[PDB]
PDB file of N, CA and C in Angstrom:
ATOM      1  N   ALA A   1    -211.573 -57.148-141.575  1.00 34.97           N
ATOM      2  CA  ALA A   1    -211.356 -56.746-140.190  1.00 34.97           C
ATOM      3  C   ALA A   1    -210.889 -55.574-140.415  1.00 34.97           C
ATOM      4  N   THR A   2    -211.184 -54.311-139.093  1.00 33.60           N
ATOM      5  CA  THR A   2    -211.151 -53.385-138.810  1.00 33.60           C
ATOM      6  C   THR A   2    -210.360 -52.851-137.853  1.00 33.60           C
ATOM      7  N   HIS A   3    -209.076 -53.163-137.422  1.00 35.91           N
ATOM      8  CA  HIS A   3    -207.892 -53.216-136.675  1.00 35.91           C
ATOM      9  C   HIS A   3    -206.977 -52.401-136.804  1.00 35.91           C
ATOM     10  N   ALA A   4    -205.954 -51.544-136.358  1.00 36.02           N
ATOM     11  CA  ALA A   4    -205.575 -50.788-136.590  1.00 36.02           C
ATOM     12  C   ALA A   4    -204.605 -50.003-135.489  1.00 36.02           C
ATOM     13  N   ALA A   5    -204.770 -50.444-134.108  1.00 36.54           N
ATOM     14  CA  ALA A   5    -204.158 -50.387-132.632  1.00 36.54           C
ATOM     15  C   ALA A   5    -203.003 -50.872-132.388  1.00 36.54           C
ATOM     16  N   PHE A   6    -201.888 -50.326-131.953  1.00 33.83           N
ATOM     17  CA  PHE A   6    -200.680 -51.129-131.940  1.00 33.83           C
ATOM     18  C   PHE A   6    -200.238 -50.389-130.290  1.00 33.83           C
ATOM     19  N   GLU A   7    -200.530 -50.122-129.240  1.00 36.12           N
ATOM     20  CA  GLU A   7    -200.357 -49.429-128.313  1.00 36.12           C
ATOM     21  C   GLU A   7    -199.236 -48.362-127.865  1.00 36.12           C
ATOM     22  N   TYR A   8    -197.985 -48.659-128.407  1.00 35.88           N
ATOM     23  CA  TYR A   8    -196.477 -48.302-128.750  1.00 35.88           C
ATOM     24  C   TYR A   8    -195.723 -48.423-129.842  1.00 35.88           C
ATOM     25  N   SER A   9    -195.915 -49.428-130.570  1.00 37.49           N
ATOM     26  CA  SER A   9    -195.017 -50.107-131.618  1.00 37.49           C
ATOM     27  C   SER A   9    -195.433 -49.136-132.993  1.00 37.49           C
ATOM     28  N   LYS A  10    -194.426 -49.031-133.181  1.00 36.31           N
ATOM     29  CA  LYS A  10    -194.315 -48.021-134.896  1.00 36.31           C
ATOM     30  C   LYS A  10    -192.996 -48.270-135.332  1.00 36.31           C
ATOM     31  N   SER A  11    -192.076 -48.730-134.412  1.00 35.28           N
ATOM     32  CA  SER A  11    -190.458 -48.938-135.086  1.00 35.28           C
ATOM     33  C   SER A  11    -189.783 -50.055-134.583  1.00 35.28           C
ATOM     34  N   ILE A  12    -188.807 -50.705-135.119  1.00 35.79           N
ATOM     35  CA  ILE A  12    -188.161 -52.289-134.588  1.00 35.79           C
ATOM     36  C   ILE A  12    -187.254 -51.792-133.124  1.00 35.79           C
ATOM     37  N   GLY A  13    -187.546 -53.306-132.742  1.00 35.11           N
ATOM     38  CA  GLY A  13    -186.690 -52.897-131.007  1.00 35.11           C
ATOM     39  C   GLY A  13    -184.871 -52.718-130.874  1.00 35.11           C
ATOM     40  N   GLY A  14    -184.334 -53.709-129.999  1.00 31.42           N
ATOM     41  CA  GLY A  14    -182.641 -53.578-129.977  1.00 31.42           C
ATOM     42  C   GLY A  14    -182.757 -52.888-128.674  1.00 31.42           C
ATOM     43  N   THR A  15    -181.667 -53.056-127.914  1.00 27.82           N
ATOM     44  CA  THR A  15    -180.728 -52.683-126.726  1.00 27.82           C
ATOM     45  C   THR A  15    -179.515 -52.307-126.863  1.00 27.82           C
ATOM     46  N   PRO A  16    -179.059 -51.518-125.629  1.00 28.71           N
ATOM     47  CA  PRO A  16    -177.727 -51.072-125.538  1.00 28.71           C
ATOM     48  C   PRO A  16    -177.186 -52.123-125.005  1.00 28.71           C
ATOM     49  N   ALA A  17    -175.679 -52.776-125.465  1.00 30.04           N
ATOM     50  CA  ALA A  17    -174.579 -53.586-125.694  1.00 30.04           C
ATOM     51  C   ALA A  17    -174.066 -53.674-124.165  1.00 30.04           C
ATOM     52  N   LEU A  18    -173.635 -52.683-123.516  1.00 31.92           N
ATOM     53  CA  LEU A  18    -172.763 -52.781-122.100  1.00 31.92           C
ATOM     54  C   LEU A  18    -173.491 -51.416-121.519  1.00 31.92           C
ATOM     55  N   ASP A  19    -173.675 -50.461-122.118  1.00 34.40           N
ATOM     56  CA  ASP A  19    -174.093 -49.377-120.937  1.00 34.40           C
ATOM     57  C   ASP A  19    -174.996 -48.413-121.623  1.00 34.40           C
ATOM     58  N   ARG A  20    -176.216 -47.973-120.888  1.00 34.12           N
ATOM     59  CA  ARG A  20    -177.468 -47.397-121.484  1.00 34.12           C
ATOM     60  C   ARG A  20    -177.209 -45.669-121.841  1.00 34.12           C
ATOM     61  N   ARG A  21    -175.788 -45.192-121.347  1.00 32.85           N
ATOM     62  CA  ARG A  21    -175.456 -43.685-120.954  1.00 32.85           C
ATOM     63  C   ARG A  21    -174.250 -43.992-121.780  1.00 32.85           C
ATOM     64  N   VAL A  22    -173.849 -42.205-122.323  1.00 31.98           N
ATOM     65  CA  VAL A  22    -172.475 -42.136-123.040  1.00 31.98           C
ATOM     66  C   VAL A  22    -171.837 -40.975-121.907  1.00 31.98           C
ATOM     67  N   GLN A  23    -170.234 -40.988-122.226  1.00 32.69           N
ATOM     68  CA  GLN A  23    -169.385 -40.160-121.106  1.00 32.69           C
ATOM     69  C   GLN A  23    -169.380 -38.555-121.928  1.00 32.69           C
ATOM     70  N   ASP A  24    -168.986 -37.655-120.839  1.00 29.22           N
ATOM     71  CA  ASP A  24    -168.671 -36.395-121.247  1.00 29.22           C
ATOM     72  C   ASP A  24    -167.201 -36.441-120.823  1.00 29.22           C
ATOM     73  N   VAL A  25    -166.326 -35.727-121.478  1.00 30.56           N
ATOM     74  CA  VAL A  25    -165.082 -35.842-121.986  1.00 30.56           C
ATOM     75  C   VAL A  25    -164.298 -34.446-121.947  1.00 30.56           C
ATOM     76  N   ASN A  26    -164.780 -33.666-123.057  1.00 30.62           N
ATOM     77  CA  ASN A  26    -164.361 -32.198-123.632  1.00 30.62           C
ATOM     78  C   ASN A  26    -165.202 -31.560-123.597  1.00 30.62           C
ATOM     79  N   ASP A  27    -166.208 -31.496-124.796  1.00 32.35           N
ATOM     80  CA  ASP A  27    -166.591 -30.762-125.636  1.00 32.35           C
ATOM     81  C   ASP A  27    -166.441 -29.743-126.114  1.00 32.35           C
ATOM     82  N   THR A  28    -165.882 -28.880-125.434  1.00 29.86           N
ATOM     83  CA  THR A  28    -165.373 -27.595-126.609  1.00 29.86           C
ATOM     84  C   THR A  28    -164.168 -26.860-125.269  1.00 29.86           C
ATOM     85  N   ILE A  29    -163.676 -27.650-124.597  1.00 29.75           N
ATOM     86  CA  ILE A  29    -162.119 -27.430-123.847  1.00 29.75           C
ATOM     87  C   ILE A  29    -160.994 -27.518-124.817  1.00 29.75           C
ATOM     88  N   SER A  30    -160.478 -26.417-125.365  1.00 32.38           N
ATOM     89  CA  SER A  30    -159.282 -26.225-125.748  1.00 32.38           C
ATOM     90  C   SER A  30    -158.747 -25.372-124.850  1.00 32.38           C
ATOM     91  N   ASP A  31    -157.965 -25.796-124.282  1.00 33.46           N
ATOM     92  CA  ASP A  31    -157.355 -24.856-122.828  1.00 33.46           C
ATOM     93  C   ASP A  31    -156.662 -23.405-123.249  1.00 33.46           C
ATOM     94  N   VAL A  32    -155.588 -23.725-124.118  1.00 31.34           N
ATOM     95  CA  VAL A  32    -154.825 -22.453-124.765  1.00 31.34           C
ATOM     96  C   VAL A  32    -155.622 -21.163-124.988  1.00 31.34           C
ATOM     97  N   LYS A  33    -156.925 -21.441-126.066  1.00 31.55           N
ATOM     98  CA  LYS A  33    -157.648 -21.164-126.440  1.00 31.55           C
ATOM     99  C   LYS A  33    -159.070 -20.616-125.678  1.00 31.55           C
ATOM    100  N   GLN A  34    -159.273 -21.306-124.537  1.00 31.88           N
ATOM    101  CA  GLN A  34    -159.992 -20.819-123.711  1.00 31.88           C
ATOM    102  C   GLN A  34    -160.035 -19.931-122.407  1.00 31.88           C
ATOM    103  N   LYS A  35    -158.571 -19.745-121.948  1.00 28.31           N
ATOM    104  CA  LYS A  35    -157.755 -18.877-121.200  1.00 28.31           C
ATOM    105  C   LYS A  35    -158.175 -17.446-121.283  1.00 28.31           C
ATOM    106  N   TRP A  36    -158.725 -16.954-122.766  1.00 26.17           N
ATOM    107  CA  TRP A  36    -158.685 -15.568-123.064  1.00 26.17           C
ATOM    108  C   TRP A  36    -156.966 -14.960-123.329  1.00 26.17           C
ATOM    109  N   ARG A  37    -156.934 -14.276-124.316  1.00 29.57           N
ATOM    110  CA  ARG A  37    -155.566 -13.915-124.721  1.00 29.57           C
ATOM    111  C   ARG A  37    -155.597 -12.826-125.517  1.00 29.57           C
ATOM    112  N   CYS A  38    -154.194 -11.914-125.300  1.00 30.00           N
ATOM    113  CA  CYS A  38    -154.114 -10.533-126.022  1.00 30.00           C
ATOM    114  C   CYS A  38    -153.107 -10.765-126.955  1.00 30.00           C
ATOM    115  N   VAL A  39    -152.984  -9.784-127.826  1.00 30.23           N
ATOM    116  CA  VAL A  39    -151.995 -10.065-129.068  1.00 30.23           C
ATOM    117  C   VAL A  39    -151.697  -8.580-129.668  1.00 30.23           C
ATOM    118  N   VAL A  40    -150.815  -8.300-130.145  1.00 31.83           N
ATOM    119  CA  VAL A  40    -150.273  -6.767-130.441  1.00 31.83           C
ATOM    120  C   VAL A  40    -150.971  -6.860-132.350  1.00 31.83           C
ATOM    121  N   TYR A  41    -151.651  -5.387-132.556  1.00 30.75           N
ATOM    122  CA  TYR A  41    -152.114  -5.416-134.258  1.00 30.75           C
ATOM    123  C   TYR A  41    -151.372  -4.282-134.515  1.00 30.75           C
ATOM    124  N   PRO A  42    -150.761  -4.488-135.901  1.00 28.15           N
ATOM    125  CA  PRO A  42    -150.031  -3.506-136.129  1.00 28.15           C
ATOM    126  C   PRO A  42    -150.625  -1.977-136.464  1.00 28.15           C
ATOM    127  N   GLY A  43    -149.234  -1.147-136.050  1.00 29.19           N
ATOM    128  CA  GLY A  43    -149.303   0.155-135.193  1.00 29.19           C
ATOM    129  C   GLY A  43    -149.512   0.283-133.836  1.00 29.19           C
ATOM    130  N   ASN A  44    -148.959  -0.841-133.373  1.00 28.74           N
ATOM    131  CA  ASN A  44    -148.867  -1.529-131.371  1.00 28.74           C
ATOM    132  C   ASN A  44    -149.859  -1.038-130.703  1.00 28.74           C
ATOM    133  N   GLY A  45    -151.359  -1.222-131.601  1.00 30.54           N
ATOM    134  CA  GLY A  45    -152.727  -1.185-130.763  1.00 30.54           C
ATOM    135  C   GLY A  45    -152.769  -2.533-130.170  1.00 30.54           C
ATOM    136  N   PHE A  46    -153.116  -2.977-128.793  1.00 33.97           N
ATOM    137  CA  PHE A  46    -153.285  -4.118-128.388  1.00 33.97           C
ATOM    138  C   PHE A  46    -154.801  -4.774-128.296  1.00 33.97           C
ATOM    139  N   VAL A  47    -155.061  -5.600-128.746  1.00 35.71           N
ATOM    140  CA  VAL A  47    -156.360  -6.551-128.832  1.00 35.71           C
ATOM    141  C   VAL A  47    -156.312  -7.790-128.399  1.00 35.71           C
ATOM    142  N   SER A  48    -157.823  -7.952-128.044  1.00 33.51           N
ATOM    143  CA  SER A  48    -158.237  -9.429-127.254  1.00 33.51           C
ATOM    144  C   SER A  48    -158.952 -10.588-128.099  1.00 33.51           C
ATOM    145  N   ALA A  49    -158.841 -11.420-127.495  1.00 34.55           N
ATOM    146  CA  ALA A  49    -159.514 -12.830-128.178  1.00 34.55           C
ATOM    147  C   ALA A  49    -160.028 -14.025-127.400  1.00 34.55           C
ATOM    148  N   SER A  50    -160.578 -15.162-127.856  1.00 34.58           N
ATOM    149  CA  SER A  50    -160.968 -16.225-127.418  1.00 34.58           C
ATOM    150  C   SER A  50    -161.327 -17.297-128.481  1.00 34.58           C
ATOM    151  N   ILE A  51    -161.000 -18.330-128.218  1.00 34.16           N
ATOM    152  CA  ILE A  51    -161.732 -19.507-129.333  1.00 34.16           C
ATOM    153  C   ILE A  51    -163.428 -19.079-130.393  1.00 34.16           C
ATOM    154  N   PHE A  52    -163.877 -18.183-129.490  1.00 33.15           N
ATOM    155  CA  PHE A  52    -164.999 -17.570-130.144  1.00 33.15           C
ATOM    156  C   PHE A  52    -164.991 -16.483-130.601  1.00 33.15           C
ATOM    157  N   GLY A  53    -164.028 -15.878-130.529  1.00 34.04           N
ATOM    158  CA  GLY A  53    -163.738 -14.789-131.709  1.00 34.04           C
ATOM    159  C   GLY A  53    -162.822 -13.203-131.241  1.00 34.04           C
ATOM    160  N   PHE A  54    -162.853 -12.103-131.024  1.00 35.55           N
ATOM    161  CA  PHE A  54    -162.453 -11.001-130.847  1.00 35.55           C
ATOM    162  C   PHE A  54    -163.216  -9.830-130.224  1.00 35.55           C
ATOM    163  N   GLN A  55    -162.737  -9.391-129.256  1.00 36.10           N
ATOM    164  CA  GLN A  55    -163.723  -8.399-128.372  1.00 36.10           C
ATOM    165  C   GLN A  55    -163.714  -6.936-129.416  1.00 36.10           C
ATOM    166  N   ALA A  56    -165.253  -6.647-129.189  1.00 35.52           N
ATOM    167  CA  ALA A  56    -165.358  -5.661-130.726  1.00 35.52           C
ATOM    168  C   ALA A  56    -166.158  -4.359-129.945  1.00 35.52           C
ATOM    169  N   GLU A  57    -166.049  -3.021-130.665  1.00 31.45           N
ATOM    170  CA  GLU A  57    -166.589  -1.938-130.032  1.00 31.45           C
ATOM    171  C   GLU A  57    -167.004  -0.957-131.130  1.00 31.45           C
ATOM    172  N   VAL A  58    -168.523  -0.528-131.109  1.00 34.33           N
ATOM    173  CA  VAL A  58    -169.121   0.053-131.753  1.00 34.33           C
ATOM    174  C   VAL A  58    -169.021   1.356-131.284  1.00 34.33           C
ATOM    175  N   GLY A  59    -168.610   2.097-132.641  1.00 30.53           N
ATOM    176  CA  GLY A  59    -168.292   3.682-132.514  1.00 30.53           C
ATOM    177  C   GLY A  59    -169.870   4.207-132.889  1.00 30.53           C
ATOM    178  N   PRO A  60    -169.989   5.781-131.991  1.00 30.71           N
ATOM    179  CA  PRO A  60    -171.152   6.565-132.037  1.00 30.71           C
ATOM    180  C   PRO A  60    -171.702   6.602-133.506  1.00 30.71           C
ATOM    181  N   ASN A  61    -170.641   6.888-134.859  1.00 29.67           N
ATOM    182  CA  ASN A  61    -171.017   6.923-136.071  1.00 29.67           C
ATOM    183  C   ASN A  61    -171.850   5.509-137.012  1.00 29.67           C
ATOM    184  N   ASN A  62    -172.035   5.100-135.861  1.00 27.91           N
ATOM    185  CA  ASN A  62    -172.671   3.232-136.087  1.00 27.91           C
ATOM    186  C   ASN A  62    -171.685   2.648-136.950  1.00 27.91           C
ATOM    187  N   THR A  63    -170.160   2.616-136.883  1.00 27.52           N
ATOM    188  CA  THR A  63    -169.212   1.868-137.315  1.00 27.52           C
ATOM    189  C   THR A  63    -169.011   0.985-136.158  1.00 27.52           C
ATOM    190  N   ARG A  64    -167.987  -0.013-136.719  1.00 28.49           N
ATOM    191  CA  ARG A  64    -167.490  -0.951-135.687  1.00 28.49           C
ATOM    192  C   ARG A  64    -165.789  -1.355-135.935  1.00 28.49           C
ATOM    193  N   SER A  65    -165.383  -1.279-134.861  1.00 26.05           N
ATOM    194  CA  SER A  65    -163.528  -1.957-134.605  1.00 26.05           C
ATOM    195  C   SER A  65    -163.726  -3.277-133.767  1.00 26.05           C
ATOM    196  N   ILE A  66    -162.304  -3.969-133.918  1.00 26.41           N
ATOM    197  CA  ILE A  66    -162.037  -4.846-132.909  1.00 26.41           C
ATOM    198  C   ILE A  66    -161.722  -3.277-131.510  1.00 26.41           C
ATOM    199  N   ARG A  67    -161.901  -4.081-130.356  1.00 26.39           N
ATOM    200  CA  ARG A  67    -161.361  -3.287-129.024  1.00 26.39           C
ATOM    201  C   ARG A  67    -160.462  -3.154-129.343  1.00 26.39           C
ATOM    202  N   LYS A  68    -159.608  -1.797-129.014  1.00 24.64           N
ATOM    203  CA  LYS A  68    -158.174  -1.818-128.696  1.00 24.64           C
ATOM    204  C   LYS A  68    -157.519  -0.954-127.596  1.00 24.64           C
ATOM    205  N   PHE A  69    -156.186  -1.538-127.299  1.00 25.89           N
ATOM    206  CA  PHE A  69    -155.902  -1.006-125.924  1.00 25.89           C
ATOM    207  C   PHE A  69    -154.319  -0.211-126.384  1.00 25.89           C
ATOM    208  N   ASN A  70    -154.104   0.246-125.452  1.00 25.64           N
ATOM    209  CA  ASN A  70    -152.882   1.390-125.492  1.00 25.64           C
ATOM    210  C   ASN A  70    -151.498   0.343-124.810  1.00 25.64           C
ATOM    211  N   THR A  71    -152.059  -0.259-123.898  1.00 25.05           N
ATOM    212  CA  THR A  71    -150.922  -1.374-123.450  1.00 25.05           C
ATOM    213  C   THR A  71    -151.273  -2.861-123.440  1.00 25.05           C
ATOM    214  N   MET A  72    -150.265  -4.004-123.469  1.00 26.22           N
ATOM    215  CA  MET A  72    -150.400  -5.233-123.714  1.00 26.22           C
ATOM    216  C   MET A  72    -151.297  -5.604-122.027  1.00 26.22           C
ATOM    217  N   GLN A  73    -150.874  -4.552-121.115  1.00 22.01           N
ATOM    218  CA  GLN A  73    -151.506  -4.358-119.436  1.00 22.01           C
ATOM    219  C   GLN A  73    -152.607  -4.283-119.137  1.00 22.01           C
ATOM    220  N   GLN A  74    -153.242  -2.865-120.227  1.00 19.02           N
ATOM    221  CA  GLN A  74    -154.769  -2.307-120.019  1.00 19.02           C
ATOM    222  C   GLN A  74    -155.542  -3.801-120.920  1.00 19.02           C
ATOM    223  N   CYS A  75    -155.036  -4.321-121.842  1.00 16.28           N
ATOM    224  CA  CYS A  75    -155.619  -5.476-122.606  1.00 16.28           C
ATOM    225  C   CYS A  75    -155.694  -6.803-122.072  1.00 16.28           C
ATOM    226  N   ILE A  76    -155.154  -6.883-121.065  1.00 13.48           N
ATOM    227  CA  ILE A  76    -155.030  -8.185-119.962  1.00 13.48           C
ATOM    228  C   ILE A  76    -155.909  -7.975-118.622  1.00 13.48           C
ATOM    229  N   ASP A  77    -155.816  -6.775-118.287  1.00 11.58           N
ATOM    230  CA  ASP A  77    -156.934  -6.228-117.013  1.00 11.58           C
ATOM    231  C   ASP A  77    -158.217  -6.002-117.523  1.00 11.58           C
ATOM    232  N   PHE A  78    -158.274  -5.474-118.644  1.00 13.87           N
ATOM    233  CA  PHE A  78    -159.600  -5.318-119.312  1.00 13.87           C
ATOM    234  C   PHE A  78    -160.601  -6.839-119.548  1.00 13.87           C
ATOM    235  N   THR A  79    -159.551  -7.159-120.314  1.00 13.65           N
ATOM    236  CA  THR A  79    -160.107  -9.293-120.466  1.00 13.65           C
ATOM    237  C   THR A  79    -160.395  -9.658-118.891  1.00 13.65           C
ATOM    238  N   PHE A  80    -159.783  -9.477-117.882  1.00 15.04           N
ATOM    239  CA  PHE A  80    -160.054  -9.952-116.835  1.00 15.04           C
ATOM    240  C   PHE A  80    -160.984  -9.341-115.928  1.00 15.04           C
ATOM    241  N   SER A  81    -161.814  -7.735-116.174  1.00 15.43           N
ATOM    242  CA  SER A  81    -162.850  -7.106-115.823  1.00 15.43           C
ATOM    243  C   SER A  81    -164.561  -7.372-116.444  1.00 15.43           C
ATOM    244  N   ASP A  82    -164.387  -8.959-116.531  1.00 15.79           N
ATOM    245  CA  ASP A  82    -165.485  -9.389-117.102  1.00 15.79           C
ATOM    246  C   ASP A  82    -166.520  -9.124-116.677  1.00 15.79           C
ATOM    247  N   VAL A  83    -166.444  -8.546-115.446  1.00 22.22           N
ATOM    248  CA  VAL A  83    -167.943  -7.837-115.024  1.00 22.22           C
ATOM    249  C   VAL A  83    -168.935  -6.713-115.629  1.00 22.22           C
ATOM    250  N   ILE A  84    -168.197  -6.177-116.591  1.00 24.82           N
ATOM    251  CA  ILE A  84    -168.298  -5.225-117.729  1.00 24.82           C
ATOM    252  C   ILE A  84    -169.700  -5.934-118.780  1.00 24.82           C
ATOM    253  N   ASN A  85    -169.473  -7.412-118.883  1.00 24.22           N
ATOM    254  CA  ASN A  85    -170.532  -7.924-120.019  1.00 24.22           C
ATOM    255  C   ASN A  85    -169.578  -7.308-121.160  1.00 24.22           C
ATOM    256  N   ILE A  86    -168.746  -8.174-121.736  1.00 27.63           N
ATOM    257  CA  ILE A  86    -167.801  -7.600-122.808  1.00 27.63           C
ATOM    258  C   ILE A  86    -168.311  -8.021-123.982  1.00 27.63           C
ATOM    259  N   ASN A  87    -168.833  -7.466-125.198  1.00 26.40           N
ATOM    260  CA  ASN A  87    -168.813  -7.585-126.505  1.00 26.40           C
ATOM    261  C   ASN A  87    -167.722  -8.285-127.085  1.00 26.40           C
ATOM    262  N   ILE A  88    -168.192  -9.222-127.928  1.00 27.13           N
ATOM    263  CA  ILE A  88    -167.314 -10.141-128.902  1.00 27.13           C
ATOM    264  C   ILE A  88    -168.548 -10.308-129.824  1.00 27.13           C
ATOM    265  N   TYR A  89    -167.399 -10.397-131.280  1.00 28.44           N
ATOM    266  CA  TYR A  89    -168.024 -10.940-132.823  1.00 28.44           C
ATOM    267  C   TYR A  89    -167.150 -11.978-133.121  1.00 28.44           C
ATOM    268  N   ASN A  90    -167.852 -12.505-134.254  1.00 28.85           N
ATOM    269  CA  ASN A  90    -167.208 -13.831-134.625  1.00 28.85           C
ATOM    270  C   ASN A  90    -166.486 -13.434-135.725  1.00 28.85           C
ATOM    271  N   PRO A  91    -165.045 -14.065-135.954  1.00 27.33           N
ATOM    272  CA  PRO A  91    -164.025 -13.828-136.689  1.00 27.33           C
ATOM    273  C   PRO A  91    -164.618 -14.641-138.484  1.00 27.33           C
ATOM    274  N   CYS A  92    -164.450 -13.412-139.084  1.00 28.24           N
ATOM    275  CA  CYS A  92    -164.842 -13.377-140.537  1.00 28.24           C
ATOM    276  C   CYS A  92    -166.113 -14.135-141.097  1.00 28.24           C
ATOM    277  N   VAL A  93    -166.939 -13.573-140.986  1.00 27.06           N
ATOM    278  CA  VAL A  93    -168.578 -13.903-141.085  1.00 27.06           C
ATOM    279  C   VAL A  93    -169.167 -13.239-142.003  1.00 27.06           C
ATOM    280  N   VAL A  94    -170.316 -13.720-142.534  1.00 28.66           N
ATOM    281  CA  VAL A  94    -171.139 -13.329-143.758  1.00 28.66           C
ATOM    282  C   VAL A  94    -171.218 -11.635-143.988  1.00 28.66           C
ATOM    283  N   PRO A  95    -171.113 -10.842-143.160  1.00 27.91           N
ATOM    284  CA  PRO A  95    -170.870  -9.402-143.194  1.00 27.91           C
ATOM    285  C   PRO A  95    -169.426  -9.149-143.632  1.00 27.91           C
ATOM    286  N   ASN A  96    -169.117  -8.783-144.159  1.00 23.18           N
ATOM    287  CA  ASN A  96    -167.502  -8.573-144.970  1.00 23.18           C
ATOM    288  C   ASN A  96    -166.620  -7.467-144.155  1.00 23.18           C
ATOM    289  N   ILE A  97    -165.986  -7.859-143.623  1.00 23.95           N
ATOM    290  CA  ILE A  97    -164.796  -7.204-142.999  1.00 23.95           C
ATOM    291  C   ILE A  97    -163.654  -6.941-143.653  1.00 23.95           C
ATOM    292  N   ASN A  98    -162.851  -5.965-143.712  1.00 23.64           N
ATOM    293  CA  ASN A  98    -161.408  -5.758-144.377  1.00 23.64           C
ATOM    294  C   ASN A  98    -160.378  -7.097-144.404  1.00 23.64           C
ATOM    295  N   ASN A  99    -160.044  -7.277-145.495  1.00 24.92           N
ATOM    296  CA  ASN A  99    -159.458  -8.748-145.579  1.00 24.92           C
ATOM    297  C   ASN A  99    -158.282  -9.125-144.796  1.00 24.92           C
ATOM    298  N   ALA A 100    -157.423  -7.805-144.483  1.00 24.43           N
ATOM    299  CA  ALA A 100    -156.099  -7.501-143.686  1.00 24.43           C
ATOM    300  C   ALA A 100    -156.500  -7.717-142.110  1.00 24.43           C
ATOM    301  N   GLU A 101    -157.435  -7.490-141.726  1.00 21.00           N
ATOM    302  CA  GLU A 101    -157.985  -7.913-140.637  1.00 21.00           C
ATOM    303  C   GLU A 101    -158.359  -9.401-140.325  1.00 21.00           C
ATOM    304  N   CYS A 102    -158.769  -9.585-141.046  1.00 21.70           N
ATOM    305  CA  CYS A 102    -159.018 -11.187-141.126  1.00 21.70           C
ATOM    306  C   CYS A 102    -158.089 -11.769-141.089  1.00 21.70           C
ATOM    307  N   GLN A 103    -156.810 -11.405-141.855  1.00 18.61           N
ATOM    308  CA  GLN A 103    -155.683 -12.280-141.934  1.00 18.61           C
ATOM    309  C   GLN A 103    -154.924 -12.339-140.785  1.00 18.61           C
ATOM    310  N   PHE A 104    -154.929 -11.335-140.076  1.00 16.42           N
ATOM    311  CA  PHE A 104    -154.376 -11.080-138.707  1.00 16.42           C
ATOM    312  C   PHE A 104    -155.018 -12.030-138.124  1.00 16.42           C
ATOM    313  N   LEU A 105    -156.392 -12.203-138.069  1.00 10.99           N
ATOM    314  CA  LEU A 105    -157.040 -13.165-137.410  1.00 10.99           C
ATOM    315  C   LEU A 105    -156.652 -14.604-137.391  1.00 10.99           C
ATOM    316  N   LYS A 106    -156.567 -15.054-138.899  1.00  8.66           N
ATOM    317  CA  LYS A 106    -156.372 -16.428-139.118  1.00  8.66           C
ATOM    318  C   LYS A 106    -154.758 -16.556-139.221  1.00  8.66           C
ATOM    319  N   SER A 107    -153.707 -15.573-138.754  1.00  7.39           N
ATOM    320  CA  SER A 107    -152.262 -15.461-138.331  1.00  7.39           C
ATOM    321  C   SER A 107    -152.376 -15.805-137.038  1.00  7.39           C
ATOM    322  N   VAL A 108    -153.459 -15.663-136.074  1.00  5.53           N
ATOM    323  CA  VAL A 108    -153.714 -15.601-134.667  1.00  5.53           C
ATOM    324  C   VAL A 108    -154.190 -16.917-134.024  1.00  5.53           C
ATOM    325  N   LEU A 109    -155.140 -17.006-134.432  1.00  3.47           N
ATOM    326  CA  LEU A 109    -155.964 -18.322-134.342  1.00  3.47           C
ATOM    327  C   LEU A 109    -155.819 -19.845-134.470  1.00  3.47           C
TER     328      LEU A 109
END
């Protein structure tokens, strides 16, 4: 014979047991970590974070820092001012930042 058609058949059957669809319940909602938060960096510069990382500022010599404020209230109000489209950076990632700034983040997250 010279027959090799199958229409749709390439793998075995089987069917869902009671419900064909699966539930959404949380996915990424850790409420305390999703509120946005500010904390006191040593030297009493205030800084902002979430579950996704820290607010970051590029300096004009093409340097980078954690975005810093003079009061907790400036930090909270800037974090609420999200219309700015605020830059965040990922905590302790492939480009190596100072270990003491990472150990502050491990002490806050």
